[PDB]
Design a protein around this motif. Structure first.
Motif, PDB file in Angstrom:
ATOM      1  N   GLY A 136       1.160   3.774   3.297  1.00 15.75           N
ATOM      2  CA  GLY A 136       0.310   4.649   2.517  1.00 15.75           C
ATOM      3  C   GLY A 136      -0.773   5.197   3.429  1.00 15.75           C
ATOM      4  N   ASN A 162       0.793  -1.216   0.000  1.00 17.24           N
ATOM      5  CA  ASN A 162       0.000   0.000   0.000  1.00 17.24           C
ATOM      6  C   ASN A 162       0.834   1.278   0.000  1.00 17.24           C
ATOM      7  N   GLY A 163       2.099   1.230   0.387  1.00 19.46           N
ATOM      8  CA  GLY A 163       2.907   2.433   0.359  1.00 19.46           C
ATOM      9  C   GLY A 163       4.008   2.437   1.400  1.00 19.46           C
ATOM     10  N   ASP A 164       4.754   3.525   1.360  1.00 21.51           N
ATOM     11  CA  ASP A 164       5.745   3.831   2.372  1.00 21.51           C
ATOM     12  C   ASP A 164       5.062   3.928   3.732  1.00 21.51           C
ATOM     13  N   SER A 210       6.233  12.842   3.713  1.00 20.36           N
ATOM     14  CA  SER A 210       6.663  12.158   2.514  1.00 20.36           C
ATOM     15  C   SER A 210       8.166  12.350   2.391  1.00 20.36           C
TER      16      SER A 210
END
Lengths: 142, 142
Positions: A45, A23-25, A75
């Motif tokens: 995410g 799903n993301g960092d 981010s």
């Protein structure tokens, strides 16, 4: 990807955020913190993992519960080290990012300590959980 | 692009294997080991770097020398972690690969210890050297 040793004990049930990390960092760290760390829940995410620890309110028989702590990451911010004290369980966890030094979760840091450096940033965690955090393993990005 | 922070002290002279690493993936670790690690020299493909440490045989005026140790990596085996104890110098080094934990170089492990994850495998090292290994930095593939 490269991963650390498993830090902690054989209790609890296994968890592994590998699939979830698609799903993301990591964008957020949520933990529950008293004299020890009682759960961890990262956000990948915009998707949180399940709550890894504090399985139920009856867990108060074996440790205190603690306070929910939330550290949002920006981010391009990523976790570059983890200082963990542990034995049969994870006792305390101190995360550092490439921007911030976060406070320790678990006021007691008397157990044996290990510092794990994750150049380029942590990708996800795995480990074992139940009423608390039986153990953790750190997974790098590559 | 990713590399660890520099582990060790300010003495000695800087070295960097970035150029020699163009000869290939690391195939061998050579070190000299006593109570501490006194040199390191990796092989990149078929080509070795210069010997980083134990500058002169007169370095016995300051420290012990130790014995040469060679770890040959199998095809496709890569170095994924290093446990480094360090202070003014690198004291001990325990390498791990994707297949195995290797023997520690340096029997003394009393200074600050860190476990460096090396994402994607070690590409090359840099650091500082003289009679011993003043410091090391691990340059990963990722």
């Amino acid at each position: 990807q490269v991963a650390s040793e498993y830090l902690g004990g054989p209790g609890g049930d296994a968890f592994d955020d590998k699939a979830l990390a698609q799903n993301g960092d990591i964008t957020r760290i949520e933990m529950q913190c008293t004299d020890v760390a009682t759960y961890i829940k990262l956000r990948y995410g915009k998707v949180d993992s399940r709550q890894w620890g504090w399985a139920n309110e009856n867990c108060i028989q074996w440790s205190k519960k603690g306070v929910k702590v939330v550290h949002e990451l920006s981010s391009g911010e990523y976790i570059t080290s983890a200082i963990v004290t542990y034995g049969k369980y994870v006792q305390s966890i101190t995360f550092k990012t490439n921007k911030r030094t976060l406070p320790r979760c678990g006021t007691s840091a008397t157990e044996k300590s290990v510092t794990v450096l994750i150049p380029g940033g942590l990708k996800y965690i795995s480990g074992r959980w139940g009423c608390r955090i039986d153990g953790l393993r750190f997974h790098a990005k590559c």
